[PDB]
Design a protein around this ligand. Structure first.
Ligand SMILES: [Mn+2]
Ligand SMILES: [Mn+2]
Lengths: 145, 145
């Protein structure tokens, strides 16, 4: 099968699903698209798009993420490290490592994400976790809840 | 971890690995790069680059392919269908289905390829396979052995 790209981050036969934005939401202006999932494929391949100014939810989990930036640019926190990310960049997120993506560089930020089909659910930071992370000033300034 | 894109189809800390070209090789002018492989990731994510005029090997196997075009443009054979492919296009190759990619449109063709870490080996065509494929005139003209 062929599903042609029709615009940056858009494809024929792939539906854009925005995440429902509630006042309490730990994320801002994010959508998801399912590019590949099949009973014979052990992983699922998605594309997430963070509107300009937005961010993905700060979280951690046992399952790893293989990410490639697909559209725009921005920044990410992985563990202790805040990186600039641009089109094509490869980010590996190892187990139980805090992470968050921000479209904080004047553009939207879209990335491919490959994860195992069988995986644990995300864990959000407790009050304690946030105090731990805010011991680093750079991280305190960067993170969004 | 971050490995930044440095040019189209190139990344900091990723080695380009050309397939060594024999006289009898069933491919032409192809390289592969390993983007992601990890004990905790059920799939392997590679980038394959076919120089202008080259092709990947005509083959089939039970294991499926999830492909996203990354660079340039070209054509692929999937089963009985020959398609034009360009940057961003999604191709899915189902089980035991003959396939080949050709950089036969004036440019190199680079693509991301996700497959299971544990998978079966590729099967190359026998004379009878080739005979059987070449019954269709359009496939006979397209394939490269
Ligand atoms: Mn996550
Ligand atoms: Mn194959």
């Amino acid at each position: 099968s062929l599903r042609a790209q029709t615009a940056p981050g858009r494809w024929d036969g792939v539906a854009v699903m925005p995440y429902k934005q509630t006042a309490e939401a730990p994320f801002q202006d994010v959508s998801r698209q399912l590019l590949f999932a099949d009973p014979n494929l052990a992983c699922e391949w998605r594309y997430f798009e963070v509107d300009e100014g937005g961010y993905s939810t700060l979280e951690r989990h046992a399952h790893v993420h293989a990410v490639m930036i697909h559209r725009g640019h921005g920044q990410c926190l992985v563990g202790e490290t805040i990186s600039d990310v641009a089109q094509g960049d490869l980010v590996f997120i190892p187990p139980m490592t805090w992470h968050q993506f921000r479209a904080n560089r004047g553009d939207c930020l879209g990335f491919l994400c490959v994860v195992n089909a069988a995986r644990d659910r995300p864990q959000l930071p407790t009050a304690d976790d946030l105090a731990e992370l805010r011991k680093d000033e750079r991280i305190a300034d960067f993170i969004r809840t």
